[model samples]
Target: YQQFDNIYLGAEASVVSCFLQDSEGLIWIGSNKGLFSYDGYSTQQHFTYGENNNTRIYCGVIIDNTYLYMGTDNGILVYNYRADRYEQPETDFPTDVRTMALQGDTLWLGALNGLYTYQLQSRKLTSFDTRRNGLPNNTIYSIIRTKDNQIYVGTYNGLCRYIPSNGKFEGIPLPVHSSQSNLFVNSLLEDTTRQCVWIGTEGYLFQYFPSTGQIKQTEAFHNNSIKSLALDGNGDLLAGTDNGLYVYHNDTTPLQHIIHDSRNIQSLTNNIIWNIFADQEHNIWLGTDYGISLSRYNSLQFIPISQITGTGDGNQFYSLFRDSKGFYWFGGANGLIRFTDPAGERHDAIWYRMGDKTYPLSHNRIRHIYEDKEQQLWIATDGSINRYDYATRQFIHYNIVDNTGTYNTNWTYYIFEDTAGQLWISTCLGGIFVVDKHKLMQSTSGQYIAEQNYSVHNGLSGMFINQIIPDNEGNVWVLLYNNKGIDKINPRTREVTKLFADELTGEKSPNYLLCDEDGLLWVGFHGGVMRINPKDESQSISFGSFSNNEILSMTCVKNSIWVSTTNGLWIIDRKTMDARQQNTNKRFTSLLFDPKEDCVYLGGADGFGISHSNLEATYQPERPILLTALYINNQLVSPRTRDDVPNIRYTNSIKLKYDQNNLSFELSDLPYSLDEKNKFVYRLEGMDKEWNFLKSNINRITYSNLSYGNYQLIISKLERDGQPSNRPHILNIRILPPWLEHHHHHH
Candidate 1:
């Protein structure tokens, strides 16, 4: 168990709702301004949206299977892990993309206007608002689903429970209140072992026993508002409050003080705790107003030695970690600290600081921490690689190479450990490090390498690596810090290959990476996520980025990819990559595939979560903007019927009007699809809303059954095996009807 004291700044803007854990146990945080992915060694920052970007990130939830649901404030963006890119569903209400909870194939989005239900297979967006639904309010704060399929939502006003049967969300019955002020539910958590629900409120904490239906109320932390709560491995509940931190161990006991020393605590000085997380190592991490704190369970007294001690290193402690070898690593403001047993005791009583000489470390602040099988503690700091040796009590650091030695000024923010025991380290400016344990251990200098094989200068596709992902094939993929694009390296051969750089007018550099179970790599970029075939490396398919495309993190579950960006989260079809590229436009944020329900959950920062099913069966032609209608002879086709079936078939021709004076009929701006056959078929008709017809050589009197009014003809194709193409087969037809005579008068 661990706790941080005053390690956060509690930016006045707002706290993020989602947190992502990569293969290396590094946590990536999404916010309004940008994103921060931190391991124990460094912090890497990336912009959400800009002139050339497309989305904003609000939250990022990992599906543990390479799928991530990135909830953005705008709309959803989907990332295909296999392709190492992102895709978004083109949406009209991009601002209404606030996502909260995802279950199975159903996504529950807490939108600005209302809650929405997104159908993954159909790409359908439906709203459940207060006017039509049992929603309490439009401002949703938090969301969670219980094992019984019950959804709990925390909004600005109160708490609400969702009944999926009829899409009903009624207010969860609160204790009878005598006062006018209402309880503002901020967060929701359910404990299965105790079958109890914990509610974080504005100025109180409430617990509801699901088995007994008993409601227990308490003034948590002296009437201080509770922001976040987490349960440790020992069943100890940690609460982050407005005034200070509190711990609730037993039901009969009062909320005990955990770390109340406000003095010398720069970050926690304000008494407002922002976020808290309990990691795999049973360490407790607290994010407060100013700094972060950590608490360790001391066996000597069965008490947790939770303290906010000043880091001998200048870095403010934000997070903590205990590696596989029981090495306690602290992520703080100055840099990363490895707790070395000063007296050779098992418990860390002394720390070996690296990074800043003034405070024993070089980096300013450490955000996250992780460790691989080799027992190397990975630290994400404000700058440089601050590696600590527990055995030697020595500090080792690495930075961008420069004439003055390795450039140690860059910020190293996030790190992770993959299943293959490879360590992925991300830096603010120095890029990413794919450290080979064998090489690092065998090196004589422990720092310097022979310019060629031992160098950090070569084998990098880009100057910066914001995120790293390992596919099922064990290939390591990296996302550039800026819009520098993506790189894939074969760990066995160490051959690095770069993709998606300087393409087209708007192609952007990548920012995040996710490798799903299908061995597909998903990439989050400045505009959207794209799916690419690592084998062919020929064509790529794109989804969204209509609003903005600052994708922060990505994950995959089931057959969908969940993308978290600056704007919102997105859910996308895994097979959408198999379609042919058309004039179609699609956008989304992040996706999480729930295996239990065989559904994919999608979240976005715009306040919504959408769950969708697989799209393998019935396929519907998505909405498209029709630009023109023409005949095979290139003649303008203006019709009167409005009942034309909108279909794009490669073998069919749509009939229209013939005007010799204008020989060419121009149509532009078509919708993109995944059908490689490009079989988007449409029929053309005349003013009487009648079908047009043309006789074949057999003169069978064939009618195309094309209905039209102000005829708008378009073409499209589907994706087949992730290949994309723009060229489509054009079908032409003639429009004729008696209503054409009245069309002149109306015109």
Candidate 2:
């Protein structure tokens, strides 16, 4: 159990008042020091220190079109979320605002003086003081609007309802025994499921029924100073108080209290809870006096495979293999760990490790695991090559013996089997070893003999082989560590041919290799990637646009190439030759594509992560393509009319002068969340024959000095899995020629 596992705004802002999840899914926190925004990974203070010097923000945030409204000690602070700055609007209200509630086009502001209403369309402010209106009290603490459009205000004395017909405020009196005279109402929340309003006051919580005009104190939070209230995903009421947090599941169930306990690390961070917010992901964020605590409920979907076996920290998983028996095996620093049923009930799984004496393994450090057609499991380890027999449940170790009669048990790197039932092994210093499986199974003795061993003495360029694989045409491709390029060995003639020697030179040795279904051999070098057609000997090299080019591993999924480099993961589309980089901050070591689950599992230096192959499941239904901004001749074009609003318009037509032919259009996918992997492909109907694919970072497309004609700018989106957008956006563009040139062309 981990207590306060994720905390933000430690000493930076101790007194947190409110939590807001913005339109972009970023968590915003308002505190006594300033306002902050959290983007899942990091927290940034958004309020400028120079302007908002130690300003206290007590009210919640609401979105009105493109701006964000929050109540602060100074006044109502309006922030332009897109511009990442604040806006000061002209108003004639008191500066010490407490809370606010939105009712369509009107904003109800609660201040220290009285309750006020501001019309958003006309920017008009209406103030109602205690003396002018028969109000409960002058100082309003909280405000809420129900689904029926009824406005409820909580003041220092009691709760009041506003009548829109006559603009009068009527106080709702509480029972004499339950009322605390002159105590302030701290928070209010309307629960539609229960058809009641939950109120949080200075000393206790109560439920109010508007239909019967009944108010009763809740026994679940007796004598507790309730500061805030919110609803969880299960429709349970979460009450934040000065003592701790109390959760009321239902009237029939007992109330659950969560408080700080030294023994239990997963308890609340601090007992002095100020505010609580439930986000879309079902995570509950608590704003306390010390910092913010996030109770992640459904943040992660992929289970950590290594942690269940208690081998995550010490073992670095290097390879993953799935056997014919539906068992999954992982090779790592601490040897092999096998799962009887990987995708089944993992907690009750039969986990096997190498250190057990019954089924003894050759070594403690394993590099690779493979299963041949003969139903035999092969494990390559640092000490020797080991084969597991399912019938006997025992391992047979085969140690390498050199010509000098000395046993060499160095690290074995890879193991592969061809269609003819022949096994090949790649070693760190022993080079390549070949074994005939048919001959080995016929032997009665425990010892097995290799058919051949190829090394520097056998006409090879180098003896240090990193990887080996058999092509579909019965050819073996080997990547030599210290050599200039790769070697292709013909199984029939036993002849070795050196490929890419001229192109791959000077520390450009191939580290990984793959032969695709289309007969294209993909070679991953130290600096770039190379593709070769073994049939025609045609080749092309692409030095990708990334700084870290030392490819560690490569695999093909569908029609795309997924490569792991020293820096991150790169996905290259075979048809379009478009590459997208993701997880750039972490270094990846291996990759595996699971066809059964339709997901790609990545093994990195930190841990493992899985990406779903079905793009539609990860992203929302494609929204109507939006034009975010527009520029003419490198200058931004401001909106001249309401229809000209860039993002709000459904369609836009632009007429460009001859000099303004150089135009740029900024577009967006209208993404609901942060999608860094989303791609865009665009083309000009009249100019280009092919669509130009662009990365998500490159949002704007520019067409320079065009020929005078009518062209349609069509832009489409491609999901992370290379699925094209179903609904593409089109814009009409016309480039009018100069008057003299137009007349000359017409004549």
Candidate 3:
């Protein structure tokens, strides 16, 4: 949990009143003094400072695909967030709105005067009060439209149910125990799961069941006025009050208080929470008296290693390996750290290095860690490879120079073991060494030299080997670093096949290797994952659509290929080959997906982040991508109305003057809750051969000076996984020629 207070919301934008996360992931924020919207990245104040009560926005509800029905102090106003504009209805209806609930096209408003129902299309306002309707009190505070099509109104005196059949309001009974029936209702929520209505009063919380006709006082908070009620991602009850935020889990009585604590950074920025809303991504946004407080649900799931191992050195972990003993061994600069329980925290870990006595490692700088088929642990270090001797709790060191005498540079890059129980160790300056694990395990101290080696002498493409991976087929693919390519080794025939980097992936600098759930071997380079079908070379293809290409590690698990790169984590389905990038900022360098527990562990420059593999299931592609703006020759044409071109937002076909051939369009995945930076791609059919992927920062797709002709503009958002988030939106555009521009102009 973190806060974006006056610093991010602006000091004048305090006193948040309501919040509505639209379908596109955009958050529409309503404050007492202004109307603002947040796109996960930044906040835009659309109405400026209210300046007067007429501009004071009290409540907001999404009216449709284009606008939000905003209830203000003076009356109701509809706001188009895409256009960043608002307007009052063409009616004389006026009132100080406190809260609002929408039932189709009509808006049931709770105002200072009374309960009013305003027909959105007809612009008709009908008021019901104590004079005509049997209302408890004229002053209304809240309204709840239930699943049963029942309208429950909360007033200053008590609750009232409006029956549409008779067009009358009837008083509802409350639980009056020990004179505790304080009926100054402030907020109401229909909880269909519990088959009850949650009512927030001045200092009490009540649950009223309509079917059973049972009313009960659930809980009470003294000296606190319940301002808002919400359900978090976990379906737990969240009550926002003047005192603080109260969370009720399991639908039980024992509640957890989440409030502003001076010492805890994760605590609320302000105790006065006016509204509480849970977004489509399960992130909770709290509209507080000070500003806004957001609790990103993903951040709670991504547990960092500093909190796990209790070590805060902030050094990088180059490799991770979990042995048969269930102990995860991770190593980098701070030496080999063994987590006795990878489940994490409070428990001490066994740190092995030359500096430690009991489990001393041969070197402090660990390049890679691997556990062979024999359950023997191998540690690749700066100058030597250490085999863990379980009995003595020490590493048996084999210096690269001593093992392979011709190798002047002693740096061992990584360690690998094949299906035939043969160990392969990659080294810098030298190439690679191969030895039978059974023979090496039986060798005496200082006598474990590997006689079989592959390098420039063996027709290898490079001197240094970065990594080695064994596919299901009886072949080992070597990632050559220096010359940049791969060395395919056939152990049976002692034959070496050198594959060019440019020929395979059209690029140099291959960094990591992984044999996925399939028999296919995947090579990860700078900006793509190359899938090579070892059996059929023609079936191999490179996937390079990712925005961030510096690939660090790739793990095949959960029927998907999980990749960690310089930007963030990405998951690509093995079958569909569709890519989905996890929205995050951690530049993970190592990734491991444990199938046993269905969890993913990520390591980066600072520490580790572990979460359940099911996090990828949160992708929602059903939401729409809003075409917010249309540009012709550079001018932004309004969607509300246009004299020349048709409303591009709603129009299927548009005609532009010959000179206005320079076209551009802007889009937004409105809510932007799941992934903050929504990627986009556009292709002009009949002209372009490929889709032009756009940067995450900018949402506009631009095309300059095109020849006069009819063309189709196809726009789509790139899902977290590289595939299109949704179907391509088609816009038929016809650019008139110089001669036809004057005759066919829409003006």
Candidate 4:
């Protein structure tokens, strides 16, 4: 049992917020639960108010030296890392923390009320409220500090700038050429080389050059609000806007748009671009609102070399493999794509395109792809079989033959190659397949075998194999799709054994199967991502999802799992799985993490694109860890002043299953948590115009009678005697609806 030094909890429901990784490699999150920090290991919850209330940390940034300023629902909180504590700098400021940035010693925070600046050394706070400061509107989403120490604030009203020298904040007069309200900037970035401040607003890409003091804004596509933006190595700025991604480059000509809207690119089926990054190799990595896409630079144009996928919509990407022979391989929906530079020309301009449709590709929808010593391409697909191929330009088509000798065709799923150059294939419907390529290449029509043709019928337990992975000892571990367990098959003795049958008895089915850098077999199913010891066949660690939803596919890169689900993509640090697993709220439907740039490409049926720099650092911890349990408890009590004493205490207790431990929760700082734990209570709060919670713990906490609106939750650790503890409690609460109603407030 763990004693609570101090527990900080709020945002009764699962509060999903925007997450940002700072330059120092610390993950700063803006959630309804408040702002938080996960230093590659554990979470340090940092948002709360009201003597004992937790304030949702919404948006924040690390300042010049030791200051951490956060935008919260109630107001603004100044955190001093040196002091390891919070100070309410904006006490009477009527603004919900929306976004933040740092320019030298001045810390700027953007919120619904306007923009506020805090002097780091003196700890003095100054407000630039809309009504008093001649700003556009009260709702501000983003802020950026230029190299010259100029602050750019993006808000609902319009684009504004603040110069610290004169303590002046004013709207930049729009040139006569652009539209009036189109200046609502959503995201801002400064490209020092080009000497331009890039502004992403409602469907427009605005460029402001301080030297010339000139402004040029252009609308690339539709009116989709730009969410993120960054500069690539090719002197071009990529914007992750709401509609899709826009690449801004100058060749002394008008900027051209490279749209990946389904018909344009075969691989990128999704269009919602969330983030963008340029990797070490100058490859542009994009994280869409859905999936991950890699833009390979060829000649002068950039094309998507790979787009990550998911399971339900299709086979999601399980793993990415790049061999020593300069070959790049991607495993996901429609199998794998292998890019081979036979000529060894590093230029992406004229590289050969070989995929499931190109070569003797075993499966169209694959989970993992790898190449062995003999240059044999091995793949793991949705099915149980591992595919092996030596020849090029030949696609393997599997046919099911009945007693009559007639064949029913099906596709293969996964493939792998062991040290001995032996190839294994995992089929979606069929069982394991071991092929001798040398012998098969000699025969026409290749070698094919049915599930019954294998001698492991008596030895194997579960027939529905999702993946087949080989360990260093030449032993094979099979992941099952239908059963509640997996089978370890020893090819030497042809003996198959089942383990964890108790854990697989019900709806639990393995979806993603992989052997990490440590050779540990990880099985990701509907609930969360789990690890297993191949030697003992024992469960080791379990990483829950950010929400109660299932994890569709997982790709481990840079010691992190790029998880794709039905909701959103997530970059999970292997070390912080325990605390991070409790946050099961914001999810990216399907995504792939690019290790080179630490970006994620999200994919979904609706669309797919890439996001930039989602990871704090390339963390390389080798120890394999497991999540045994996630204990979530309400840490604070916010007394409702308008209504009678509530029946249920403000604090609550929640427990996450060891198996279904990959999860996220919500707590009520006000109204209730974002997740409605009690339908009656939430409805009462709604009627009384009080507080209501949304999605929180994975339990009987049902959701009902919820009205749609923006909400947040603040979670923090409980402190006792000036010491911080893991157990979190919550405090200070506020509930904001679309519109304020006086009648409901009177109750």
Candidate 5:
């Protein structure tokens, strides 16, 4: 089982206060330790004080085109976008800043002391802290300005509104018990679309409509402290609380509750959330005490081909084969199904089942499906071989006829057609049968007869032939059951040659066979894989060890061979003789690669999964790499600097002592798409000669016992097009010598 790895824990900070996505698409995370910016590949701390100073940013963060304003314990910290530095603006309020709002050239600040408005153009500040100015309370928790030129303030007592014309604060009656007068309002949001205001308190959630001047409490939120509130694209209200998160639709129906699920690793990492922010892409980012949790917005990509249409017997698909006319046929345990147009409307698809009275099949249990040169579909079943006639919508059964003229029933397992118009049929216990397609099609008596049959008595070693394949040299290869090895047959001479007799020792039988474009035959045994050279039968290589030995299916493209085993999916490099296993925790049954769409279709016990081979076609170009954290000699690097530097490279790039040669680089790629299968490739220019490919979960790379020198590191992501990213991120590194060696050196 794969568990969710916390991106920032001991590496960056433990607690997160708020999240903000800047206008440039960079994610800014506010925490109790400091402020950080993430560019997908790296996370760099941007705001922090010197030693012995605590930088606790709480309420929220807002960004305009020019600067980023963050509310902190000390005061409001302003970050200049163009200058890339933090500046402490001069203000009269000397208390903790709770929240902030911007309207035109004025900045509304909510603080523990009182309410203050700073005019940006005139550089003037206005304060209203006394009851004489119609201020209800001096402490303010949340603040927001409505579209109708009115301001709403949430405080320790109740909800209050400010009228610009009267320049006075009016107490808004909240829908609550009379005894709960000291209700703490934590969050407030203005929904201009509905002309209403949403208020979150310590005890309940209420919505107030300005048009009716009425407030009503919703029953969706439980009796927990509501910390934050936000609106989703679907007009749903997302409530973040100390217990968990809740989604209320239209302020009425409770949609879903997202909490910490120990059974599911992908669930929320922590239940105690502080705030929620919905980005422009509709993705939700949650700030929790442990770290940040991101919920990516994605659409369904895999279209399941099931028996829900009532046209097939079972949904467990065994084989998937596409015909020449762009049609698809699915073979299952109970019957066979064909789709005239795969891309057509799913509900209105033209599906043809096997058990129909008009065109009946020999048996309902289909073992394999194949398409021949004449565009005719051939089905192998438990009873007999059937050829489908598309135009007539009928099946022509090919029954076995022995020398005694009596019809013998045989279970056909595999079927293949050669270039010379000959059909090779493998049976369970009746041996291999060869038929002449021309003679079988021209028969007028409607009786199918085999041209030849090979068994143990007539040059064959075993009677059970499970699989068959035809090579480019007009040679037919058959996999014998019961560990009898493989037989190579010459169609011209009808000569049978036994190959790999000494190597096939185990009781495990060969299950799959395939001939690549280069004439190399791949054989999948019960627990292993073998590559054979047809020309030189003596030249054979066995694949590496795998978790499971039963290879069910395989597909090859050039030197890359993709295999599906009972354990998982694996890709083998033929030239390098290396095998890399993927999704090892999940089992797979079949695999099919579509070159036109550049996707790999996988079928397993549960359902179907599609992997896009081209990353550029699936993801947006703005997705970047972020360098999260760095450590040298097991000591965390301090990001706080006195200089007015916005970038993290200047503070992160340090000269490590010779004893502190060990270093770790933590990085990540912002996943913008639903496809979570991302690959990374990196190269250390000073140490490595070529790029190194790492697994999906291995986000951190470490180098130990390094020599004192300057090094450059570059990392790139593998796109869906099977190529590295065009623009990779680079990092500069420098290692210093020992103090004694430095003293005896140049100085």
Candidate 6:
């Protein structure tokens, strides 16, 4: 759980008027000052300026593919998210808008003046008031569409229903109260499971039966106003009120009330709740008067190693390893730590810090943690190494100060286990150590054989080793800090071969090395990827797509290569050779692919983030988009008696007259989230030779003056190489030509 303070949100966003989560996973926060969009890491303030005067945003915010219809003090603020532009689409709309609900192309807005509806296609705004209209009051506060094909409106005076049949707003009777403010409706929600509408009023919570017209009042919320309501993933009702947050499992029983705790920063920010939103990940966001609080989605799965070890210094953990017993061990700048699991319980004693004679550590700054086949843990720290004894729970410290005189310092960085059961220890200044694991585990870890130490004098190309990677070819690949680039040591023959020293780089700055499921050796550099297939140099390629993004860590999961670079997290498909950014906003320095959970464990400056590995496969399948509104001759047309045009939503084919050849299609790809990343590759078969990629965040497709021809427009998600991830939607359109009178008479 996290709270966005006033300082982080720029001034006192203390009064959050309205909050919305868009398809792009960005949170739109509306306040009296302006609107801001939060993208997980940072907030982009949208204090847009134009002829419009005020920036006061109301509670009603509607998002379409192209625009965000936000009601303000003046009128509607239409924000074109794709172009990052704002437009004031007042269209004679009413001011002081309070709530809204979209039904097709029409946007229903509730305002202090009256209930207004804006026809997006026709550019018409109709207002309904108490005069001649069946509205109980002109001050409309909330409006919601139910599953029963009915529109319910809640006003400052009472409740009412909008009759589309006659364009009338008929008042629905509520139990009359003595205090007129009790009739002030604030929020409305349709409960499909219960087959009723949950009505939130100034002082009470009520369940209204649309068909029966019976309003059942629930227990009072401590006489506090139920300002807003939302249904969570667990189908529970989360009621936001002036008192705090109240969760009710069912209508009759209240689960618990969560309030602001002065001692607990993770608690609700304030008791004056304005709105409640359940985001894509099921995180409940509370829009309180003071700020916002998020009950995060599965917060336990991710936690900083510093937090787990209870280290206030917040030293970075360089290495994370899981032993055969499934215990996780971390090597950090502070000490060596081990845990059965980071999840659950109060692990009071996990840290093994320095300056203890009984359990003497090499140094405070630890680097790498590795476990050999014997299940013995070897911790590499500054200037020495420590072998953990499971039997006695003590560290056996040793230094790699061999008598050979080829070594500089024994500042360890990494460790690799070869096929011959020999441990290859890499040092920051010293070359490498190939010590017999059996000999070291049986006796003391005090003496490292001088002959086993391999350096530039021992036929190795580099003096300072950074990483050691053992491949399936019985060879140990060493990442060097020197200009030699890389050195491959054949353990069987005991010979070092300098490979790709020129092609890799003479920068002497290698980041990481990994031998994947295949024999391919992936070497990560400052900002590039080098895939070396030892048998064929032609199969290797230097990837510079991540320009200037210094590589931090690398791990392979199935056929995909997950790399954490300074730019962010990137995934590369080994089979398709397709590469794309998973998350470019958050900085991740280390990556550990958890195969058991099929997720990625990310470690960076901010700490841990357990991100779902494959985004496309993680969530539910995004359904195929249906062509929404169709326009002929630049006029919005549909299969209705008024338009006399074909319905493109279900129809596969449409015929356009010669005179009405101009065509425009609006797609409703609103079913999926991540609206910005929602991309489509579309092709007009008769006109296009290849599939043309559509600009992400824009869904309107238009064509003017089409010649007489049969054309097919194909739209689908990406598979790269012009392939489709899912079945493509094919709309066959035929344009008719005008018949000449002379030619008809001759025939």
lDDT of each: 0.50, 0.71, 0.74, 0.50, 0.69, 0.70
- List, residue by residue over 1-747, the lDDT tens digit for candidate 6: 234232136554557777776654556787766777664434546554443623767775556666677777887777765445565654777778888898877888899888888888787888888877778888888998876668889988898888788888787777777765447888899988777788888677888887677888865765798899988867788889999887878756746877788887656788898888888667777777777776654321346665565565454656766777776666566676667545433454356777766555768777777777767788877857777887887787765655666463368877756667777788876788777667655656455553376777767876667778887667788887745468888777788888776667754256578878888888777656667776666233344655667777788977989877777766877766566775426566566776764566666553566655665533223455667566777776543223345546657887666666788876654432332355678878888898777776667788787788789988887643445655778899877678631221110
User: What does candidate 5's lDDT look like per residue over 288-327, in tens digits?
Assistant: 8777777665531344555325433345566667777666
Q: After superposition, how far is residue 725 of candidate 6 from its true place, in Å?
A: 33
Model 2 residue 224 lDDT score = 71
Clash count, candidate 6: 4
What digit string (tens of lDDT, one per residue) describes model 2 on residues 686-724? Answer: 999988998666777899989888899988888546866
RMSD of each: 27.9, 20.6, 20.2, 23.2, 16.8, 21.1
Candidate 1: 10-residue stretch with minimal lDDT = 299-308
Q: What is the TM-score of each candidate against the true structure?
A: 0.37, 0.46, 0.49, 0.36, 0.50, 0.45
- Candidate 1 local lDDT, 126-231, one digit each (tens): 8776777767777776778899988888776777787767878867776644542665677678888767789888666888776776768855345577888789
- As for TM-score, the candidate ahead, 1 or 6, is 6
Candidate 2, which segments miss by more than 4 Å at Cα? Answer: 1-273, 277-302, 311-313, 340-354, 392-394, 400-410, 442-447, 541-545, 614-747
Error of 6 at 676 (Å): 22
Candidate 3 residue 177 C-alpha distance from true site, Å: 12
Clashing pairs in 6: 14-290, 23-674, 23-675, 24-675
Residue-by-residue lDDT tens digits, candidate 3, 245-313: 888766456788877877765568789988888886777788888878877664424444565565665
Count of clashes in candidate 3:
17
Comparison by lDDT, 2 against 5, better one: 2
RMSD of 3: 20.2
Compare candidates 2 and 3 on lDDT and give the better one. Answer: 3
